[PDB]
Amino acid sequence: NKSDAAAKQIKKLEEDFDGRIGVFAIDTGSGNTFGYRSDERFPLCSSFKGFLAAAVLERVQQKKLDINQKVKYESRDLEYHSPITTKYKGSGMTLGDMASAALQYSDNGATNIIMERFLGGPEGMTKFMRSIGDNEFRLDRWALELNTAIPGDKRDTSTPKAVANSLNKLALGNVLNAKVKAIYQNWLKGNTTGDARIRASVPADWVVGDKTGSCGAYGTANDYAVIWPKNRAPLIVSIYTTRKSKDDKHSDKTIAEASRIAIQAID
Ligand SMILES: *C(=O)[C@@H]([C@@H]1N=C(C(=O)O)[C@@H](S[C@@H]2CN[C@H](C(=O)N(C)C)C2)[C@@H]1C)[C@@H](C)O
Description:
Layout: H1 2-16, E1 19-27, E2 33-36, E3 42-43, H2 49-61, E4 70-71, E5 93-94, H3 95-105, H4 108-117, H5 121-131, E6 157-158, H6 160-171, H7 178-189, E7 207-214, E8 221-228, E9 235-243, H8 252-265
Antiparallel strand pairs: 1-2, 1-9, 3-6, 4-5, 7-8, 8-9
The structure holds the ligand *C(=O)[C@@H]([C@@H]1N=C(C(=O)O)[C@@H](S[C@@H]2CN[C@H](C(=O)N(C)C)C2)[C@@H]1C)[C@@H](C)O.
Residues 45-46, 81, 106, 108, 144, 147, 193, 212-214, 216 line the site of the ligand *C(=O)[C@@H]([C@@H]1N=C(C(=O)O)[C@@H](S[C@@H]2CN[C@H](C(=O)N(C)C)C2)[C@@H]1C)[C@@H](C)O.
Keywords: Antibiotic resistance, Disulfide bond, Hydrolase, Signal
EC number: 3.5.2.6
Pfam families: Beta-lactamase2
């Protein structure tokens, strides 16, 4: 019945903005879950950088890469929205600093470079996801081309459920060892682009790590988070939104509100 009411509220919240909300949330402490449209597909946008950072950390763990290796790119034409990589064009960044820049600032330069040299491109990223048992994720195109968010296009989509599951496996599970998992946890905690999303849905005492995405088309936006509540087991919250018209703008407020509803549903 708690479930059924949470769902009516998402239903209404989506009609209010003329769009389409996908929700999955997990209380790791009880196993309780809430999903609404949790098996529908939605554009990832930048949200895949969260996973991309994880794949980097898996390669570091496997000893294929070193976390402090220098990454030089002094002749690159840096993609738009490369706020961190721009400031070190001349000197390069450590692999680790670069990966975290990709997560924490949605830096497209960091993203595309990492995917070029270390990850085998979009197919390699899809391969990583498969390898932790995520069958829904697909990345098709590179950082700046994956944002078209066209209704009915499976390219560069996942589902709220798959995203949530993957996040749990990565941020809380055993894909990454204790040391490496903690690093990844801190990277998520230091996300700078999520203040109006899932962060705005919880008491300010709770610690959140997250990755956002904003397609800038079809008013498509999303956020997924691990949440550490006061003296309580972790929650995972996954929220994805699209809108009916190409020109529509995304809605932080809707995302924050669907998060509130989702957290209550599993509470
Ligand atoms: C991917 O989705 C795109 C980038 N990732 C974003 C995000 O994480 O939500 C968006 S919004 C971006 C956050 N930094 C900018 C900012 O601080 N404001 C202008 C205030 C906006 C971002 C476009 C993109 C890289 O493809």
